[PDB]
Amino acid sequence: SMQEEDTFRELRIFLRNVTHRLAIDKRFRVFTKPVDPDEVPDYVTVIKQPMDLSSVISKIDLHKYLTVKDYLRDIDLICSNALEYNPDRDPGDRLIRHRACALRDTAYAIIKEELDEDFEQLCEEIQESR
Numbered sequence: 001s002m003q004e005e006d007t008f009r010e011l012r013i014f015l016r017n018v019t020h021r022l023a024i025d026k027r028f029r030v031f032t033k034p035v036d037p038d039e040v041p042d043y044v045t046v047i048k049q050p051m052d053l054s055s056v057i058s059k060i061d062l063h064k065y066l067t068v069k070d071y072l073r074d075i076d077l078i079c080s081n082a083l084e085y086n087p088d089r090d091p092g093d094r095l096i097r098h099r100a101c102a103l104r105d106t107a108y109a110i111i112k113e114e115l116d117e118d119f120e121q122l123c124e125e126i127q128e129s130r
């Protein structure tokens with residue numbers, strides 16, 4: 001309905017704002033753009049489903065997220081990809097892992113503090129009805 005599309009529009013507005021706050025954080029610059037295959041050749045074969053904050057923005061705008069659970073699955077994908085690609089004990093790997101976990105924790109913390117549980121529940125019930 002028209003009411004329901006207003007609901008999803010509010011969700012998109014909320015998700016753009018959260019994603020922008022993540023993308024301007026200096027700690028998360030490594031996650032703001034897709035991995036360039038020319039710079040990193042072994043990536044595109046180790047990570048089967050790349051995800052980054054710029055691609056998150058595109059998906060918001062393509063109306064791919066109808067719930068924040070859908071959005072958090074891509075945030076979690078950004079994190080788990082980073083952990084999978086950087087499993088070694090060396091400092092570079094361990095710095096990226098720390099930032100990946102901080103990206104995840106920050107996203108979950110903003111949503112917990114700022115997204116009304118009933119708003120998300122409404123989003124899920126509209127989704128489950130389609």
Ligand SMILES: CC(=O)c1nc(NC(=O)[C@@H](C)NC(=N)N)sc1-c1cncc(N)c1
Pocket residue numbers: 029030031032033034035036039040081082085086087091092093096
């Ligand atoms: C996405 C990601 O996790 C990532 N990890 C990296 N790790 C490394 O460079 C070293 C420390 N570890 C290793 N095992 N290669 S660089 C990198 C990345 C590559 N291209 C573009 C963007 N933005 C990020």
